[PDB]
């Protein structure tokens, strides 16, 4: 559930996350946050 705005990047969870351009979807470098 990504509620970020599409058009930017931020260090969320345990890895970056370039907010996609559609919303509710980011790239993120990886996934090391088992939360």
Q: Which experiment gave this structure? A: NMR
Tally the domains of the chain.
Answer: 1
32-1-3-8 Cα dihedral, nearest 10 degrees: 40
What is the torsional sign of CA 8, 5, 11, 25? negative
Among 16, 18, 21, smallest CA distance to 33 is for 16
Q: Which tokens sit at 13?
A: 């969870």
What is the per-residue DSSP string for the chain? ---SPSSEE--BTTB--EE-SSSS-B--S------
Residue 2 belongs to domain spanning: 1-35
């Amino acid at each position: 559930e990504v509620t970020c705005e599409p058009g930017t990047t931020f260090k969320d969870k345990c890895n970056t996350c370039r907010c996609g351009s559609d919303g509710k979807s980011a790239a993120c470098t990886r996934m090391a946050c088992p939360q």
